[PDB]
Structure formats: structure tokens, C-alpha cells
Amino acid sequence: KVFGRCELAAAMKRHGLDNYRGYSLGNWVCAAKFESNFNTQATNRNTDGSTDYGILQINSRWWCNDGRTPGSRNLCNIPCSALLSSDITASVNCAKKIVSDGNGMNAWVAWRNRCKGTDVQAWIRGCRL
Ligand SMILES: CC(=O)N[C@@H]1[C@@H](O)[C@H](O[C@@H]2O[C@H](CO)[C@@H](O[C@@H]3O[C@H](CO)[C@@H](O[C@@H]4O[C@H](CO)[C@@H](O)[C@H](O)[C@H]4NC(C)=O)[C@H](O)[C@H]3NC(C)=O)[C@H](O)[C@H]2NC(C)=O)[C@@H](CO)O[C@H]1O
Ligand SMILES: [Cl-]
Ligand SMILES: [Cl-]
Ligand SMILES: [Cl-]
Ligand SMILES: [Cl-]
Ligand code: NA
Known part of the structure; x- marks a missing residue:
């Protein structure tokens, strides 16, 4: 499934990601945009032999x-x-564990390089929520 932007924002909010570990909803939407382009089926191989899976590109090494x-x-x-x-429940539940493991959202390289420090609230512009 390729989520719409506000569609994903709503789903993430419902599943309790908004301000989870202090990260506002726009951070999560921005991370998903640049990790997977909002595509739940995205997979990418890493050099260490692991693979990243799904809308938040969760890594099989860990x-x-x-x-x-x-x-x-x-x-x-x-x-x-x-x-x-297509249901993001498992990815959200796992992301909560990831972001709690010490490094916060720096676990998502695309978040660190493309979202961190930017105007992330713009990612939920126009959404009802
Ligand atoms: C080439 C490249 O950068 N590819 C990206 C992938 O690496 C990335 O998926 C992410 O992969 C990294 C590297 O394996 C992974 O980061 C590691 O995560 C573990 C677990 O949280 C960290 O270990 C913890 O460290 C803290 C702080 O020292 C400890 O307090 C804690 O006890 C440790 N936990 C455990 C269980 O031991 C590593 O320190 C950390 N390593 C680095 C170098 O950051 C991320 O978790 C992976 N992220 C996700 C979302 O799975 C992938 C992300 O989509 O993106 C590729 O491009
Ligand atoms: Cl978008
Ligand atoms: Cl394995
Ligand atoms: Cl990046
Ligand atoms: Cl926000
Ligand atoms: Na594994």
C-alpha cells in the first residue's frame, strides 16, 4: 500500500506515535517519506547482509x-x-521499541539526514487529525 501523507499521519497518530518518546508526528511522517516513500512494501538490502523492511525501513540485523x-x-x-x-500496527509497535533503545530517531538514517532539525510540522499541513 502506498499511503497518502495525511492518511499515514492519521494512522500513526491513532497508533500513538505522535510525540512518542518526544517526537512529534511530523518527524514520523518525514521519516516514512524518505525511508519508504510511504510504501508499505518497500525493502532494501544493506551491505552487512541485513534488509530494511516496510514503511519505516526496519532492519533485520536488530x-x-x-x-x-x-x-x-x-x-x-x-x-x-x-x-x-498494509496495516502499519506491527511497524509502529516495533518503531516504538527502536526509538526507545538509546539513540532516539537517529536510528533512521534518512530522518537524521533529511528531517532532523527541519520544519517537520509541514509534513502534517492540511491534515485534519
Ligand atoms: C548503510 C546504512 O547506514 N544503512 C542503514 C541501516 O543501517 C539502517 O537500519 C538501521 O541499522 C542500524 C545499523 O545496524 C541500526 O543502528 C543500530 O541500532 C542498535 C539497536 O538500537 C544500536 O545499539 C544500541 O546502541 C545504544 C547506544 O549505544 C545502546 O544503548 C543499546 O543498548 C544498543 N542496543 C542493542 C540491542 O545492543 C546501535 O548502536 C546502532 N548502530 C548504529 C551505527 O547506529 C538501526 O537500529 C537501524 N534502524 C532501523 C530503523 O532498523 C536503515 C534504517 O532504515 O537505513 C539504512 O540506510
Ligand atoms: Cl508527500
Ligand atoms: Cl536470520
Ligand atoms: Cl539519508
Ligand atoms: Cl509535527
Ligand atoms: Na534478525
Whole structure:
């Protein structure tokens, strides 16, 4: 599924991501935009053999099991394919664990390089919410 911008904002807010660990909703929408272009089916391979999955590009080295990232963790206790669902529940629940693990949203490289410090509230402009 390719979410619309306000559609994703609403879903993220409903699932409790707005101001989760102090990160306002626009931060999360911006992160999803540049991680996946709002596409729940996005996958990308990393150089260490891991893969990033879904709307928030969650990485199999740490967070989910894909069966082909040897020596990795599965800290969200979920198959990585569950992070590709049209329903973002699993991705949000896992993202909450990620952003709580010490580095905040710096876990998302696209957030750090493209969202951090910018006018992220613009990402929810026009949305009812
Ligand atoms: C080439 C490139 O940059 N590719 C990007 C992917 O790397 C990235 O997916 C992210 O992958 C990184 C690197 O593996 C990962 O970051 C690591 O996360 C772990 C777990 O949180 C950190 O370990 C914690 O460190 C803190 C602070 O020291 C400790 O307090 C805590 O105890 C540690 N936790 C554990 C379980 O040991 C690593 O420090 C951290 N490493 C680095 C270098 O930052 C991110 O979590 C991955 N992000 C996501 C969302 O999964 C991917 C993101 O979409 O983007 C690629 O481009
Ligand atoms: Cl957009
Ligand atoms: Cl594995
Ligand atoms: Cl980047
Ligand atoms: Cl915001
Ligand atoms: Na894994």
C-alpha cells in the first residue's frame, strides 16, 4: 500500500506515535517519506547482509527475523514480512521499541539526514487529525 501523507499521519497518530518518546508526528511522517516513500512494501538490502523492511525501513540485523541475516537479533519478535503489511500496527509497535533503545530517531538514517532539525510540522499541513 502506498499511503497518502495525511492518511499515514492519521494512522500513526491513532497508533500513538505522535510525540512518542518526544517526537512529534511530523518527524514520523518525514521519516516514512524518505525511508519508504510511504510504501508499505518497500525493502532494501544493506551491505552487512541485513534488509530494511516496510514503511519505516526496519532492519533485520536488530529488529525482525527474515531467516537470512545470520548472527542477527529479532528484538521486536516478529517476522520481517509482517512489517510489509498494509496495516502499519506491527511497524509502529516495533518503531516504538527502536526509538526507545538509546539513540532516539537517529536510528533512521534518512530522518537524521533529511528531517532532523527541519520544519517537520509541514509534513502534517492540511491534515485534519
Ligand atoms: C548503510 C546504512 O547506514 N544503512 C542503514 C541501516 O543501517 C539502517 O537500519 C538501521 O541499522 C542500524 C545499523 O545496524 C541500526 O543502528 C543500530 O541500532 C542498535 C539497536 O538500537 C544500536 O545499539 C544500541 O546502541 C545504544 C547506544 O549505544 C545502546 O544503548 C543499546 O543498548 C544498543 N542496543 C542493542 C540491542 O545492543 C546501535 O548502536 C546502532 N548502530 C548504529 C551505527 O547506529 C538501526 O537500529 C537501524 N534502524 C532501523 C530503523 O532498523 C536503515 C534504517 O532504515 O537505513 C539504512 O540506510
Ligand atoms: Cl508527500
Ligand atoms: Cl536470520
Ligand atoms: Cl539519508
Ligand atoms: Cl509535527
Ligand atoms: Na534478525
